[PDB]
């Protein structure tokens, strides 16, 4: 068959791209998320909620490992997340085949952003509807990055995304600093996620990921319950 071969994203009379704005508006309605780094590693926290008790909470995951030391979380549309995850895995594989070394974080961020940008200029397609957070630990210094449906990216110390992201950023403004440890970072991440959380926070509604110079991994529900207790 064939496609259409004409761009669906065009310039308005006021010099603005409408579709990117609508994609950002769709992103703003997703599940909230928070990300922090303090001098030793990075913490990614996200909130998950099944509609009823029928759903199995251990069947799918939000935090996904690209490789041994890169982590990624999302906010926005659901199905579009897997395509980006799969593409990132492929890209890391070609990099490792060519150079025989684990990929640096910045290169992976740049390549993923390039794909996401290219997806808004071709013909007969519509842009993605997610916003990503990427974390890693290479050569000692930890790294945190955030993407954008338009393809741009930034580097952050602490970031909040999803619903009520403005309140999260203001809250992090008066709390975060440049010298803490991973445990206190976890404490403040749960504290700031409690701002818009549900009535009762259980050990299964929350997913937490930690990166240190030992590798990326996803916290099991037991220690998540341990952290939820003795706090708040």
């Amino acid at each position: 068959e064939r496609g259409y071969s004409f761009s669906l994203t065009t310039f308005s009379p006021s010099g603005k791209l409408v579709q990117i704005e609508y994609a950002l508006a769709a992103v703003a309605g997703g599940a909230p998320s928070v990300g922090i780094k303090a001098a030793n590693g990075v913490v990614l926290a996200t909130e998950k909620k099944q509609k009823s008790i029928l759903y199995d909470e251990r069947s799918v995951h939000k935090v996904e490992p690209i490789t041994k030391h890169i982590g990624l979380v999302y906010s926005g549309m659901g199905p579009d997340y897997r395509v980006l995850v799969h593409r990132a895995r492929k890209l890391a594989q070609q990099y490792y085949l060519v150079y025989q070394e684990p990929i640096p974080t910045a290169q992976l961020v740049q390549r993923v952003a390039s794909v996401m940008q290219e997806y808004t200029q071709s013909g007969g397609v519509r842009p993605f509807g997610v916003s990503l957070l990427i974390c890693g630990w290479n050569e000692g210094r930890p790294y945190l990055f955030q993407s954008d449906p338009s393809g741009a990216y930034f580097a952050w110390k602490a970031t909040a995304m999803g619903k009520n992201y403005v309140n999260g950023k203001t809250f992090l403004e008066k709390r975060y600093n440049e010298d803490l440890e991973l445990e206190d970072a976890i404490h403040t991440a749960i504290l700031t996620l409690k701002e818009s959380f549900e009535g009762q926070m259980t050990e299964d509604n929350i997913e937490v990921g930690i990166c240190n110079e030992a590798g990326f991994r996803r916290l099991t529900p037991t220690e998540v319950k341990d952290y939820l207790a003795a706090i708040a």
Partner: protein, 240 residues
Amino acid sequence: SSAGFDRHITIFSPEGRLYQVEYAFKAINQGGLTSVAVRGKDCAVIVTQKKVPDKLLDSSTVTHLFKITENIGCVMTGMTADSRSQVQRARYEAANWKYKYGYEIPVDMLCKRIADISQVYTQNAEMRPLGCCMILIGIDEEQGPQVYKCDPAGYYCGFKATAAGVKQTESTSFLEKKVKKKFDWTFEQTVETAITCLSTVLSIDFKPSEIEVGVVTVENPKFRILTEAEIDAHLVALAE
């Protein structure tokens, strides 16, 4: 709420939504049929209704149950042709996995591959996103029974009790009320609950010739369809 061609193809509306996909969800209800799936301690049951309005039609070829693989079974709802096409794609994909990797395919990988295939239709602006649903049941080593569901928007998940069709909401409510009690589950209990759910949602008190049942269990993982006689046996055993 709309501006331009957002009502005719799959692009974002100003509020951040897209309607060409949520129209398919209500296109599902055109068939007017309901199916239920229940998972037990060591077995899984799929039950559905069938309606034959005319005597001239041959009743032996109206089944909605399909044998995807000797160990994996499925049930469909919605438009018939789309469901048949999805069945064809699933069969081909399972056979290809067996050819390539040399061992049987897990059910979750199959569901993920199907959902990833379906997600493209809601990305490009020249196709229509196939208004038909998907329910699969299977047995996995070290896990036991598994029940998964897939939808036209590309969202797959794993459930413990599912209903798809016209009466989805109240059937899920009844199943939740039953499952909150946290009682032991065996084969007969699971089948009885699955049948009574549909019986009380529709309020029919039907006969052994108007439903279909499929079952899988850890004694012969082959997917099998119950014959009318043993279906009548369960039906009479249910009524004391």
